[PDB]
Amino acid sequence: KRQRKKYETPPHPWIKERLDRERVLMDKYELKNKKELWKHETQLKNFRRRARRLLAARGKQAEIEREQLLARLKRLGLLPEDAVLDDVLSLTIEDILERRLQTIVYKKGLARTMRQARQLIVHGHIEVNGQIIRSPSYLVLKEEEDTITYARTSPFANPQHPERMMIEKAKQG
Amino acid sequence: TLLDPLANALSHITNSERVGKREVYIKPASKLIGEVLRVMQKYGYIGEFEFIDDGRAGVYRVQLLGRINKAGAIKPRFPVKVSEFEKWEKRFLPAFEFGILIVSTSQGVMSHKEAIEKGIGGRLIAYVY
Amino acid sequence: SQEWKEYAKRVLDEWEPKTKLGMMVKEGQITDIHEIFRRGYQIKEPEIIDVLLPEVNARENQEVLDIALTVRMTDSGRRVRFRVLAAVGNRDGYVGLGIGHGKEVGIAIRKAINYAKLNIIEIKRGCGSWECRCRRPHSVPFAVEGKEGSVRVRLIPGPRGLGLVIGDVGKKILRLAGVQDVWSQTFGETRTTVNFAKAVFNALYNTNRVAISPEMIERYGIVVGRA
Amino acid sequence: MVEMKFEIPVCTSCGREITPREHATHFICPNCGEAVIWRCESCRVLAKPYKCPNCGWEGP
Amino acid sequence: EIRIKEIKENKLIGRKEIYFEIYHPGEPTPSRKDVKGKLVAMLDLNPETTVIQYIRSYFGSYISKGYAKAYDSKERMLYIEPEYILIRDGLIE
Amino acid sequence: GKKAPNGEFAGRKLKLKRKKFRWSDIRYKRRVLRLKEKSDPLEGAPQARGIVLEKIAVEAKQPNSGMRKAVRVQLIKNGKVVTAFCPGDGAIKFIDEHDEVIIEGIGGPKGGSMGDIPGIRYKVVKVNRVSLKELVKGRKEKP
RNA sequence: CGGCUUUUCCGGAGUGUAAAAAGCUCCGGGAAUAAGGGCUGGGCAAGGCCGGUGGCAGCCGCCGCGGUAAUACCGGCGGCCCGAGUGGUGGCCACUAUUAUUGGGCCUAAAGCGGCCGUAGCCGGGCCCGUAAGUCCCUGGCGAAAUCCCACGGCUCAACCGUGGG
Numbered sequence: 001k002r003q004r005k006k007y008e009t010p011p012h013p014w015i016k017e018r019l020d021r022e023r024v025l026m027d028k029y030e031l032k033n034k035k036e037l038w039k040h041e042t043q044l045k046n047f048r049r050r051a052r053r054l055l056a057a058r059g060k061q062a063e064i065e066r067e068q069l070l071a072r073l074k075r076l077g078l079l080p081e082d083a084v085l086d087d088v089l090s091l092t093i094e095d096i097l098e099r100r101l102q103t104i105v106y107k108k109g110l111a112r113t114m115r116q117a118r119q120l121i122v123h124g125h126i127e128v129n130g131q132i133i134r135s136p137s138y139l140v141l142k143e144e145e146d147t148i149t150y151a152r153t154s155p156f157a158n159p160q161h162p163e164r165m166m167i168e169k170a171k172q173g
Numbered sequence: 174t175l176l177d178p179l180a181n182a183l184s185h186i187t188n189s190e191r192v193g194k195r196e197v198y199i200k201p202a203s204k205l206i207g208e209v210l211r212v213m214q215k216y217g218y219i220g221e222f223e224f225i226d227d228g229r230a231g232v233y234r235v236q237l238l239g240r241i242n243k244a245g246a247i248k249p250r251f252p253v254k255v256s257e258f259e260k261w262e263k264r265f266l267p268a269f270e271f272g273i274l275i276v277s278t279s280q281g282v283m284s285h286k287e288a289i290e291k292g293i294g295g296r297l298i299a300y301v302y
Numbered sequence: 303s304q305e306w307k308e309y310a311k312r313v314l315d316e317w318e319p320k321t322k323l324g325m326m327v328k329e330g331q332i333t334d335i336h337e338i339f340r341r342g343y344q345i346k347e348p349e350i351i352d353v354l355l356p357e358v359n360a361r362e363n364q365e366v367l368d369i370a371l372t373v374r375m376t377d378s379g380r381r382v383r384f385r386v387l388a389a390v391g392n393r394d395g396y397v398g399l400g401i402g403h404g405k406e407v408g409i410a411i412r413k414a415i416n417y418a419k420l421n422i423i424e425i426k427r428g429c430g431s432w433e434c435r436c437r438r439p440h441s442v443p444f445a446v447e448g449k450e451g452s453v454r455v456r457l458i459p460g461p462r463g464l465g466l467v468i469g470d471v472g473k474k475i476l477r478l479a480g481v482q483d484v485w486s487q488t489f490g491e492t493r494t495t496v497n498f499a500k501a502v503f504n505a506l507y508n509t510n511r512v513a514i515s516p517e518m519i520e521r522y523g524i525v526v527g528r529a
Numbered sequence: 530m531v532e533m534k535f536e537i538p539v540c541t542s543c544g545r546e547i548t549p550r551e552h553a554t555h556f557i558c559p560n561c562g563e564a565v566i567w568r569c570e571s572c573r574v575l576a577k578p579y580k581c582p583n584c585g586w587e588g589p
Numbered sequence: 590e591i592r593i594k595e596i597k598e599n600k601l602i603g604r605k606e607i608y609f610e611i612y613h614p615g616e617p618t619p620s621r622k623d624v625k626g627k628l629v630a631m632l633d634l635n636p637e638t639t640v641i642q643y644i645r646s647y648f649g650s651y652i653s654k655g656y657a658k659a660y661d662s663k664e665r666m667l668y669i670e671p672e673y674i675l676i677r678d679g680l681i682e
Numbered sequence: 683g684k685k686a687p688n689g690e691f692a693g694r695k696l697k698l699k700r701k702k703f704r705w706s707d708i709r710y711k712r713r714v715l716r717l718k719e720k721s722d723p724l725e726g727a728p729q730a731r732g733i734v735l736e737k738i739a740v741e742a743k744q745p746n747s748g749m750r751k752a753v754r755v756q757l758i759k760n761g762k763v764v765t766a767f768c769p770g771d772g773a774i775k776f777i778d779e780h781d782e783v784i785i786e787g788i789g790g791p792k793g794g795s796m797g798d799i800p801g802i803r804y805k806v807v808k809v810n811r812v813s814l815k816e817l818v819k820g821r822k823e824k825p
Numbered sequence: 826c827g828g829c830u831u832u833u834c835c836g837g838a839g840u841g842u843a844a845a846a847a848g849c850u851c852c853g854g855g856a857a858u859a860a861g862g863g864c865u866g867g868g869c870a871a872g873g874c875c876g877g878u879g880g881c882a883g884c885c886g887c888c889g890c891g892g893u894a895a896u897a898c899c900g901g902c903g904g905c906c907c908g909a910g911u912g913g914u915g916g917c918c919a920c921u922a923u924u925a926u927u928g929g930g931c932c933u934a935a936a937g938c939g940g941c942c943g944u945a946g947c948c949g950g951g952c953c954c955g956u957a958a959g960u961c962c963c964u965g966g967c968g969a970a971a972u973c974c975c976a977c978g979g980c981u982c983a984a985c986c987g988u989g990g991g
Contacts, residue, residue, distance in 0.1 A: 174950085175950060176948065176949050177949080178950080201950070201951070203950090204951085231951090252959090252960055252961075253961090254962090255962085278962095279961055280961095292962080293961065293962060295960085296960070296961085
């Protein structure tokens with residue numbers, strides 16, 4: 001046995017439609033490589049395959065797996081608390097990308113621009129539930145979402161950090 | 174030589190439907206054929222069906238309601254368990270629960286849906302949709 | 303919408319009707335597109351259909367599938383001609399295909415557009431998948447087959463958001479028809495895009511042909527025409 | 530979004546529905562004058578007989 | 590700041606196992622001597638009989654995990670404990 | 683007629699028929715008999731080391747016209763002699779008699795001759811443990 | 826142009842070794858401070874100008890370009906893809922319904938034996954009684970672990986590992 005990549009490369013690299021769509025997603029969300037996007041899309045496809053297999057299965061094990069799948073998806077915040085097994089097929093990549101650490105902190109207004117958010121996360125200025133995490137590609141659970149704050153020892157815990165008032169003004173502006 | 178009455182009967186039914194004939198006569202009126210004719214009638218594909226005492230093998234008379242896209246006989250009578258239905262059902266029904274398969278089981282020749290409801294395996298004999 | 307009615311008003315004010323179908327669409331008697339289809343009438347004035355379906359005039363809803371250059375040889379030159387395979391369809395289950403001959407590309411495109419307008423057909427849509435079963439017209443209601451040339455195309459219902467699993471030509475054809483997901487299986491030469499497009503059109507048209515019981519309509523939420 | 534579920538014509542001689550681009554025909558009953566018979570192309574070309582549902586009148 | 594999360598007494602061995610957190614926000618990882626001298630205070634142990642096994646600093650965490658032992662007689666460590674840990678704690682030259 | 687056999691209890695003839703007509707395929711037939719492994723001068727090596735014997739110009743197939751430079755190489759692995767193309771522009775100057783060259787496949791259809799050049803099968807990659815690509819580019823220097 | 830962070834570098838402290846080693850983690854000084862590879866006629870469509878070579882040099886996965894303005898050779902400019910990677914060669918699978926049980930063909934494209942008999946093999950009319958071998962359902966022992974999938978938990982997340990289910 002050898003371990004295997006968790007992401008699936010696209011079947012054809014030079015399709016104009018996919019190229020432009022991925023480019024738009026890249027520019028909006030500003031990932032470093034298409035590798036991250038492909039990893040996220042592979043996660044999406046995994047969830048969709050699980051839903052497909054479960055929808056056609058009868059048995060106690062199928063029910064337990066279905067409940068667990070819905071529980072995890074709700075835990076991620078990707079679905080409402082009254083979600084069913086049908087709408088999961090309607091999930092898109094953008095739902096996942098909205099749940100990214102970088103996307104969440106930027107939506108939490110701690111960065112003027114999400115690239116600056118990526119820098120802050122990398123340099124360890126952003127803590128999750130009091131614990132730091134240096135992967136912007138990390139996926140943030142719903143429960144974690146309210147505990148996202150600046151790292152305590154980092155200067156950004158200081159309200160007077162010169163970049164901090166610019167951050168807060170751009171948030172206000 | 175007539176190796177099988179059932180497949181011939183179903184082929185005749187389909188060919189009659191396609192042109193649009195009103196009444197169909199099945200020459201080797203076997204018991205299994207009669208049990209078969211009961212099934213899709215119970216599911217409304219056909220109307221009344223009757224037996225005729227011909228003195229050779231009898232003849233089965235049916236009238237066509239124009240509601241049978243295609244009917245045939247799954248020939249090598251594959252034994253199927255309760256869980257393996259969707260495998261064969263994906264092979265012979267155009268869509269999900271579109272049409273019915275017919276299974277010869279311990280409790281008789283009878284519809285695949287009810288067999289799932291009874292949870293009993295058997296041997297596929299024919300398909301129609 | 304309001305723009306579409308505005309164009310309907312313009313083409314009503316201009317187009318004098320000739321055929322028999324023209325008046326009871328210029329007189330307000332007919333209001334549904336499928337009112338043409340149900341009675342088995344015929345269409346030879348494209349101006350009729352856009353009066354009921356102005357959405358054709360959108361640029362996105364009209365596709366050019368192929369441009370081909372056919373060479374009629376002659377004793378004093380290789381006189382060429384453009385054949386345009388085009389498809390015009392709204393995104394609510396009505397679509398048509400056409401082939402236009404032209405001395406120039408532009409005239410070929412115009413004639414192809416008109417012929418695709420005249421070959422408009424209604425469509426059945428549903429959720430026949432063994433997985434989705436959502437009772438919404440995202441896919442075909444059931445497995446169907448179309449044939450043309452050596453091309454045989456079997457469309458099978460596919461789960462929601464799968465994406466059109468078919469070649470690009472069929473991708474465009476099913477895109478303009480208001481259908482979103484499908485499994486495809488092709489046999490023969492798919493390279494000749496004209497025959498492939500015709501086979502897909504045959505499959506979509508055959509979608510109507512199947513006999514249907516009232517229960518399965520509620521089962522699959524079948525939509526015939528406009529969703 | 531009110532559903533405009535129409536009524537697809539159904540040919541009397543067979544009971545099948547009529548495809549949009551078929552060369553079927555609809556006509557008032559030539560005997561009773563009350564019922565409109567629909568007749569699809571498959572029935573028409575083969576000229577298999579049709580029966581009126583009102584007076585029972587029959588005719589190819 | 591030291592917060593003990595577990596104190597297990599191994600009656601068979603005669604030792605108190607000590608599992609603890611140390612809060613050192615914005616500070617280096619504390620030295621062994623300082624943590625030993627702080628630990629002995631509120632538990633009233635003999636420094637010679639007490640040995641600190643490990644002090645692991647979790648990544649990006651200002652709370653460090655520490656594990657130590659506190660025996661009863663001076664012979665138990667010599668007979669039982671690895672010779673190297675005392676050398677780390679300096680109880681052996 | 684209909685495809686046969688189809689009986690429930692005719693597994694043997696089905697299997698035997700499939701085995702019988704699988705040999706008619708050429709890919710599977712080649713793989714099982716390992717014919718390439720018997721015929722390969724490289725004996726299954728994607729890359730091989732050899733010694734140049736001489737330099738030859740070969741005419742490209744019509745309608746193309748050109749004088750393609752290449753080198754005959756005596757293989758160290760088994761002694762058999764094969765001809766290898768020299769890619770790049772003017773690369774033949776860098777190559778000399780009695781030069782330790784490293785060659786690989788040329789990439790033609792079925793691993794055969796590529797492009798308009800017929801009969802050739804291999805191209806020269808390295809010479810004296812220095813790569814031809816840089817030498818034609820001139821970035822590195824031959825020893 | 827102004828402001829800001831600390832990837833690296835230096836020091837200390839822990840673990841660390843049963844020994845350093847890992848520089849692993851924490852704190853401290855301090856600085857903008859590690860980036861290429863291939864392609865750029867079409868099949869790949871992803872990308873257009875300039876100079877040189879001129880049936881030569883050459884390129885080319887295949888189709889093809891070069892016989893003097895070369896969007897295809899070479900070089901410059903510009904552009905496209907991927908990226909701490911990226912190209913060249915060889916093998917297996919898919920591509921391929923070109924191995925066809927699902928699911929290929931056999932009049933003219935490769936393929937019906939020239940025909941007939943018949944052993945084995947394969948496939949076989951209808952009704953009723955019987956056995957229950959195949960078959961279908963239930964049920965007990967069994968098919969090592971790891972590896973597969975899933976939820977939860979530990980290493981910052983993950984990779985990895987434990988717990989529970991299949």
